[PDB]
Ligand binder design. Structure first.
Ligand SMILES: [Mn+2]
Ligand SMILES: [Mn+2]
Ligand SMILES: [Mn+2]
Ligand SMILES: [Mn+2]
Ligand SMILES: [Mn+2]
Ligand SMILES: [Mn+2]
Ligand SMILES: [Zn+2]
Ligand SMILES: [Zn+2]
Ligand SMILES: [Zn+2]
Ligand SMILES: [Zn+2]
Ligand SMILES: [Zn+2]
Ligand SMILES: [Zn+2]
Lengths: 256, 256, 257, 257, 257, 257
């Protein structure tokens, strides 16, 4: 198994003792994802990518963070929706910080944080800095962290054209849209009912944000773009591209 | 599905709209469990129990807390072991607090926290208190919480007698022993290898604790008792007793 | 000379720590209801009295005690809904323990005994200790050693237990305001106990789970979890000698001269 | 009359809020390196200058700006390893925003515009707002409204973008110490810019991931993420008018008189 | 009938609060070095003794005192570099005060007097009060009132001052371990004072600024900021009567029956 | 060359720190009501102006000032109940000071002067400094030195006081919006002062204790604690010269070039 949770402490110890062990931590959320998809998408997707990447490069995957930061209107619909269960920034930051501290204690020195929930980014960044700060007090400067949101690896114009023959709309509105829905159709079809997709024009907003969040400014379904054209085929493409790209990136930053 | 993460936000909203929806939250840890068992035991077990109880009483299960409080020598071997990845008390407390705040926002008013890691108890307690304190600030006083550790429902003398024809020696030393190992053999046999069990005598300690934790005071394998006599059958019985007992307790506290 | 740090001059304290093997003791209690027959500072008074006697025997020093502890829980203290009980949030207690260890380490002390007298304090004392040791480690300090214990855990001799609990040991959690604490109080501070006000009720029992908000009905009306009807000075004196002796021996073993 | 709260007496401020529809604006910046050609308080100076001009047009008031912001990130500000850059922890910035909102609500104010000038501040400003609104709700207050924006987002007109970047727009992320900010500075504070010191390097490019500890080698030597060689006072005046007009209109829309 | 809450049963306490105009008093001290002639728990002992006497006269109740206070400052307590002195971080002290007020309010109490005995505690007590009142407001509670004071501020009469300091008033800040505190201790706890060990140095003087890390050389070697050579039980009795009467009167005025 | 860090390039800043003896100065103020005759940013403007002049004379650099300070207290600033005054919680201010010191240390700086302009900030500045020095100690760094001062403490010469107050000085406590601050403002920013609006009331006096919630009636209606009727540009110029000279000499003493 490539999952730390499924290993005995002895097996884990031996792997870290190897010296070049790479650990991966998926960071997701419990968030509404329209009428056609379930709410644990942000955990399921990066976890599936982590598993596949780990199998290829000989890495290990830590239990994923199930709850993430508050959903923002322009990227995830808004934290006013039912189901969405978000943590305060301090809580998410502290969780990341605590995990890094513990991994360093084990003797680990290579960590990849794979974000699957757009809004988590800056709090992950702060948790990393606080953990690295503490390691520095002990004179430790060899703990290295690579942070990434898996969708950023789908850049190849050729790939983008296949997935979006009519044009890429941007990652900000890819919440419950073609990208996430296609991956889900390929990985967990039973958790997706494309027939329930509520077609609507791609969400647009003015150059600013308003709080309290105005529910009227988010498409009724909660999605920011339609997944009507999502498909298992597109999902298989996205999956291979991400796994390959991320596997290469990790081998690059954490070589033998 | 009985898992909130596998529902759409509309399906979840509908269940809460019913008025008497009971939500369940498993709280575990990533911790060493000897040479014969994996490290996510404390998440897997309460989650499996929650699932079965939820199926029986029509409740829903929230994503579980994967990381818990620091392992203590007398109950989990100690936080010095590799693999064990623990959170600070404030972090765990804050996580529980944030989740309750969000569930209340959804309109939910009935929550069952099922602890699977001994050491989490008091921090779960503080998280609950802080969240209820805030709810009262908003005039909300109808949010009710039931907290329990699933093993406390295995107290019937006849059951203990059948499970331990030699004698029960308390839940304290039941870390990686007969109880947890038997449950795992019944639910996830592939994650257990009885041939690797180190059959040492029950762990004993003086009436006080020492910090920094002294490794010599914990049996080398990390277990506090031998799981040599663990069996699938013992696990099936434990599972039956726990599910029935918790289901009855929840119906009592959260009637239709 | 006094065994209490508070009654020493800084020069005397400094000299004792300069010795090199000085052991410090910190009582951790609470302000909590203890039925109709006993006062509310029991959890401070008792561990403080034990520390004093242990200190006198092994040559240790006792720090001012923590007067307020963690929230009373229904199954071990009656519940935090009772009047009088004044509790701190976990972070507050944890931080207090953390600050004190930091300061003792600054003084040059390296041996500390935390003696808990309020059941609910345990885990927050543990977190306070971990956070303080973590910070000491940042400065390369790994020789600070801590021994934490709840004084009642030393009362284990089958023979002594039989006298206190003729019908069986009820468990340290439901001992709140019962025979154990009341007997000690009768022996140490009789003026603060009125055995005639004891409301005799059966030992408190609870289901295998807890409910919040706490339900007042599931706690005996007087606030006690077990009856102190049979409490006596004699039982108190026995408990006292057993604790002092056992704790003194434990400290001598962990912190040898 | 001044549009800055700091330059008013408390009586004058009180009267303005008593008006009932008073709009307050808070500039949120940072002290951060901005290449060899510009000073380090750019992120405070620019949003404050924009706030002043917007306030003059719509009759709003401007609060003292936040001088220190969140840690500079490699992909958007060069990195927090540079000298001069003085950053706050996320909790500190969030708490500052939170405290100010709480206080303004106490004054009776209910309309606030937070104008961010430092790319990295965004999410911590967002958390500060959420925590403050949460507290207001506890006190039964639900009419406090907040508008948050990063001023450069108002430069949307394809015609304006083309004038600034005739060879193509490469994004706001690498617009640190580049054409955009440098042009505005040339138009507002020319004495604080030495265009002759601009190190004309190719625009910064990074792989689809982040690495920590930040690797200095992955940031252009000067600290800038794009060359300001083509910056000019003319471009600056266009940007200024575009931002002021757009924001003024947005506020009139969200906070009608 | 004891005036200490800790020595009451929860029923007795409940009955007192039920009165409707009950006044609670909380001593806030510290564990701090006090020269070669006095013990280190002075800051707790003195305000507690004053609270007890005031309570007896006005029918109030006294809560367990805070044993540890904020970090000793050079100009008012000698400095936190001294052995023995065991200080809390500001957040810890503030949080302790906050938790206590929250609980007292839960009991139904609405009148609290915080009597400070350690100079440096003041602003953290103030913050704890503000945060507690803020929370009470969220709960719709606005009738909780707090009076905070440092007992020495009540010694104002010129005649009294001259009797105490024939050479001239030195200011309450340098009155650390000097005539004022030592005299009170001589009148209240003579066994904890050895006037023969007093080091008769001239009053400490400092430039108009502070330096950190604290420089030990800038504090008189004994730790005292002024000489207690002329301290006496007679002066102690005078101070005690002035403080008790003045405070009793002030409380009667702020918390009328 | 500017003495303000914000107006320097990171290269210029780096070079100055490289000198190995660079002194950094941080103004710490507040946004607070200052009567009917003066604006609310006084506490930022004054220490910043003093820092600028001192820096010009001794070759130091000035950091962006803290614009918001701790909650106004009745006896020193009128009270936090006034409109306009926008205060931070203690933890927020302490955290801001702490974060800035961490960053300056990272830059390689080791000499810092914090110039307080708001009475109430003092203890939180102190705690921020302690927490920062504590963390530096975790990294084996103990050569970072901090000097903290409130600029008005340098106006102590009897001859100067006599010239400024030919009718008698009554202390710094009541100098909120009075002669001292108003005179400085008249000399530095005359347009922000309108002496004709001064409410000439008698000096504020208070009992030896404080009450919370704060009672508005106990503060002079205008918000000032003493009348600035006799304030003048001349008095302001004198105060400025004395403060700048005194502070410059103190800094040279503590941080020799
Ligand atoms: Mn998401
Ligand atoms: Mn466990
Ligand atoms: Mn207790
Ligand atoms: Mn920036
Ligand atoms: Mn003191
Ligand atoms: Mn002020
Ligand atoms: Zn998603
Ligand atoms: Zn387990
Ligand atoms: Zn007790
Ligand atoms: Zn910038
Ligand atoms: Zn003292
Ligand atoms: Zn002022």
């Amino acid at each position: 198994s490539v999952f730390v949770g499924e290993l005995t402490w002895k097996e884990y110890e031996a792997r870290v003792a190897a010296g070049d062990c790479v650990l991966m931590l998926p960071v997701g959320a419990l968030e509404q994802h329209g009428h056609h998809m379930c709410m644990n998408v942000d955990v399921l997707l990066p976890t599936a990518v982590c598993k596949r990447v780990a199998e290829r490069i000989g890495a290990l995957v830590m239990p994923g963070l199930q709850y993430g930061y508050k959903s923002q209107q322009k990227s995830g619909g808004g934290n006013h929706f039912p189901g969405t269960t978000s943590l305060d920034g301090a809580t998410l930051t502290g969780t990341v910080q605590d995990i890094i501290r513990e991994l360093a204690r084990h003797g680990a020195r290579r960590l990849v944080l794979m974000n699957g929930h757009y809004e988590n980014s800056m709090f992950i960044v702060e948790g990393i800095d606080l953990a690295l700060r503490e390691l520095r007090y002990a004179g430790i400067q060899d703990f290295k962290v690579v942070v990434l949101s898996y969708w950023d690896f789908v850049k190849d114009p050729a790939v983008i054209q296949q997935l979006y023959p009519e044009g890429f709309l941007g990652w900000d509105i890819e919440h419950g849209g073609v990208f996430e829905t296609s991956l889900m159709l390929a990985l967990y079809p039973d958790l997706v009912d494309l027939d329930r997709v509520v077609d609507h024009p791609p969400a647009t907003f003015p150059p600013y944000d308003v709080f309290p969040v105005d529910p009227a400014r988010t498409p009724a379904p909660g999605t920011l773009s339609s997944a009507k054209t999502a498909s298992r085929e597109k999902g298989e493409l996205i999956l291979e591209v991400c796994v390959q790209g991320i596997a290469d990136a990790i081998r690059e930053e954490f070589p033998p």
